[PDB]
Amino acid sequence: SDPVELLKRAEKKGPSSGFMKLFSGSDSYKFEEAADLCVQAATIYRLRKELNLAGDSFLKAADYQKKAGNEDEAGNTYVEAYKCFKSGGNSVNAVDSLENAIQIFTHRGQFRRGANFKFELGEILENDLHDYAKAIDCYELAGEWYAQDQSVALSNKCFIKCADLKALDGQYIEASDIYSKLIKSSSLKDYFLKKGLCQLAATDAVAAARTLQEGQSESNFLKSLIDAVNEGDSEQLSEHCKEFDNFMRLDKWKITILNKIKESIQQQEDD
Amino acid sequence: MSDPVELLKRAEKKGVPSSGFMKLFSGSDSYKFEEAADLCVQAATIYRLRKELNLAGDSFLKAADYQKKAGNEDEAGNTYVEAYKCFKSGGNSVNAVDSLENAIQIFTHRRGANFKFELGEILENDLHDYAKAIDCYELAGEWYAQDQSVALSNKCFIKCADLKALDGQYIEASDIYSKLIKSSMGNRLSQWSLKDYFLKKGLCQLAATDAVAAARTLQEGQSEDPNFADSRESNFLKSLIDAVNEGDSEQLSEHCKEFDNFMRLDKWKITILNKIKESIQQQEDDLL
Amino acid sequence: MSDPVELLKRAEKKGVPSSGFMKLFSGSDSYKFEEAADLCVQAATIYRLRKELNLAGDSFLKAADYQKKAGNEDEAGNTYVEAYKCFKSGGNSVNAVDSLENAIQIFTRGANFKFELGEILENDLHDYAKAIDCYELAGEWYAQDQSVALSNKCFIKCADLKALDGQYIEASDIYSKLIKSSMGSLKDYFLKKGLCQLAATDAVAAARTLQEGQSEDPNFADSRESNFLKSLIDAVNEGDSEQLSEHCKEFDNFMRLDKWKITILNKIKESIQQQEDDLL
Amino acid sequence: IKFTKQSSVASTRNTLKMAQDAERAGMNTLGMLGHQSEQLNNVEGNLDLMKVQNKVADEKVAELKKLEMELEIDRNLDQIQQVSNRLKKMALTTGKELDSQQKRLNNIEESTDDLDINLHMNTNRLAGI
Amino acid sequence: LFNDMEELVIEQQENVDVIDKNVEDAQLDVEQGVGHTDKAVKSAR
Amino acid sequence: SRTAELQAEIDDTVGIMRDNINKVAERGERLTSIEDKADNLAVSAQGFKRGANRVRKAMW
């Protein structure tokens, strides 16, 4: 009942040779025993609320099950170690846990479950570690897998989380193209508006007018912006954004992009 | 990860049937084909992980071929379906068509219907081979009627009838709409599709310059379905028949605009209505 | 493709049980029946391909019989469901009924198929009594599964068919069960209950049903259905068939009377006219 | 004056009509949603029984290996209002039921994939015995 | 909109039917298999 | 004022019903996926049954 002792024995037991290999049953059975011992210690830790120790115990477990030749169970235990590490605020080892779980789920053909966790992984990269360049990759590969599964909704969700973040990273046109693909394969107002705003943030107003016009088959505020920009006036825009802030509070994304548009105006006034 | 090219080479080496004197000492070649198929499937999975989807499809086709040679037809059909998934997703519609055709041939030898409908969808949208798409939808709906999935049969037959009507086969489309009506009668659940079916049957008949059959279709619908009797569709069909009998194309255009304002005419209806208008205008020109 | 007739002939030849001295050396006949069933299944698939659906159903029935002889009753039930699909697709409702009966017996999913059997008995064969039985028993199995909704659809069908068949009291009781299961369609159940009670010339029970619905369900209290049932009760108490017809037309003008309600209402009117005639 | 009043008499009769059509459609929607809810009940139940059975099969396989006109407008509006309030109830009702069934389907489907995987595992192990 | 609430639920009725049939079929063959392994284990001993 | 309230109610119910259309579309997606996996589960169950029975016959 002492988890320390459970882990001691899990180390002592988890490859035999010599007389030991001959007398005692198969090696994978021993690795399974050590796996179970670490699982038991991990559950004791989880009950006692030492989450980090519980997740490290599940990591030891996971490695033991894959040394036994149990890939699926290993993936499950990696997800469990992630539950512990995530609930314990230890983001780094939680990211690690998912990378192993995904690694398995992916090589094992379980792409749908891969995607589910690929997305969760991207969420923690974006929100906590703030490594957006890799969160975009996760949000992209996960949506591509969802595309293979023909589960359009989740794929879309992934590509929106991708496009938004790419518009923040400054890949404005790539974002607008992801948004176009999100309009063709489909809330449809926001995609048009976001596309126009991104495109205006790239100082390309002609396409912006074009892409509203395509949206005749929010949109009015976009004209008001296309006009404020087309006449080098960062007080018309700054007033239209202020006015639109009443009937639809701007979210962080819009505020960022709109500040970039305002700057792209002022820099053009002083050129 | 293993190199998929090397896996395919090993699959090819193993997949050689035993010839000559060696055939007397070698067991069934089925096991060799199974192992070659396994190697092909591993190569296909590695390609799929690399997003090299067309190569994954090709590897799955090779695996399915070896599975067929092994006597494991069901696994071959599954692997053709996987090859198909790789091909559709890679934008290679032709090899996707081929994969579905082999898979359907195996399955047929309910699910066959499913894949036949998907094949019809590819033929319609990606390849624009409307005739074979019509064939796929017809046969799929027939299989669904033989499985009593009345609704899948109805979806296949609406696709088949729409494509036939757009293709100028107005009479056959009207007959399929008659079947759809007969399968939809008395169900509280298909009554809206029932109004649409009556309207489309009438429009097809009017495209065939058989205003008589349109009037009879309208009378049948008015008598058999009270919801259709009082519907905008029934009144619109009356109005179109009346314009056709009068030989007044302008009146038909006005009726089309009026119906459009309240109930948007989808593209199919616009096409068939334009055909009816042209038939009226041609009769006007020929009478003069 | 193999010839399905030859496959059936091989299935027949393999399906002969080992008799006599041979029984001492042959293993279990189960394997022979399995192989005969497999051959029959292949023949059935080939017939299904050719759209010869009744023959495919017959081949599935033979395969299911061999599966029963093999001790694989569950395969037999699955194959009976397949034979059913072939028959009801081929318009041979009788063999479809037989297949569902064997499948249901094995399963006792039964309920699901017992309901489909009731549907065939109602619509294709018009054996309303057995359809009533099928719906009642399916609904009971559903109630045992704490399946309120499936139980309810079965009891709605059972009550409707019973009421159309002259069993007004039993239909009213099944409507009572539907009401008790739906408390907390309900307005409709109250109406139908009273209507059966009016077709049994039990006006006072209809009045109690109205009062119950008014007290227990506020939505029914203020509903057109409650007012309509009250008006019908008033007409029945007054012996005025014309007032009843007027109420029926008004309710029709605002809420289309389906065929069932029309039939019940016509019988109620007929009863009223009969006491009028009996008093002359 | 009169023509318009006839026009709105028409508008409100047709309104009451198609509102009733919405009503009947919405209820039979809800009817089959209850039907299909209970169907997903048994799908869950057999998945549960198979989970237990796969536990048993796991242990057995392991051991094996070891071994007049105004008034009518008013009344038509009355009845349209009644139906419209009630239809609002029906829309909220359908949204709730779809939500519950959506979580149930997700759990069902994950369980089905898990059982499928376990069955391939046990079958492959049995092939080697 | 209600009319689509009616038709789409019909299209989904079928999926529910086939799912229920296939799942309980799988359950029975799992039962037969578990029994098969039980008798496997009795004579393996 | 009554007609405007009725209109507001109808618009709200239209919104709820559009939401429902989106939800039922997601549900139909999900049911198609479940039917595919249930077919897979059935096939695996037949296979497992047959394999176990063959293990019995091999042993006995």
Author numbering:
A (entry chain I): 2 to 15, 17 to 188, 197 to 227, 237 to 290
B (entry chain H): 1 to 109, 114 to 292
C (entry chain G): 1 to 108, 115 to 190, 197 to 292
D (entry chain L): 433 to 499, 589 to 650
E (entry chain K): 213 to 257
F (entry chain J): 27 to 86
What's in the article?
SNARE (soluble N-ethylmaleimide-sensitive factor (NSF) attachment protein receptor) proteins drive membrane fusion at different cell compartments as their core domains zipper into a parallel four-helix bundle. After fusion, these bundles are disassembled by the AAA+ (ATPase associated with diverse cellular activities) protein Sec18/NSF and its adaptor Sec17/α-SNAP to make them available for subsequent rounds of membrane fusion. The disassembly requires multiple ATP hydrolysis events in the presence of Mg2+; as few as six ATP hydrolysis events are sufficient. The side-loading and side-release mechanism explains how Sec18/NSF can disassemble SNAREs with constrained topologies.
We chose the Sso1–Sec9–Snc1/Snc2 complex (referred to as the ySNARE complex) because each component of this complex crosslinked with high confidence to the D2 domain of Sec18 (Snc1 is highly homologous to Snc2). We prepared the y20S complex in a nonhydrolyzing condition and, after single-particle cryo-EM data collection and processing, we obtained 381,591 high-quality particles that yielded eight three-dimensional (3D) classes into which models were built. In the structures of all eight classes, Sso1 is threaded through the D1 pore of Sec18. A characteristic phenylalanine side-chain density in Sso1 is present at the same position relative to Sec18 in all classes, allowing for reliable indexing of Sso1. The nucleotide states and the arrangements of D1 around the substrate were also the same among all eight classes, with the ADP-engaged E protomer forming the top of a spiral staircase of tyrosine residues. Protomers D, B and C were all ATP bound and formed the middle of the staircase. The bottom protomer, A, formed the base of the staircase. Protomer F, with no apparent density for nucleotide in D1, was not associated with Sso1. Given that this charge distribution is replicated between each pair of D2 subdomains around the D2 surface, it is unsurprising that the Habc domain adopts multiple corresponding rotational states over the eight classes, presumably because of the flexible linker that follows it.
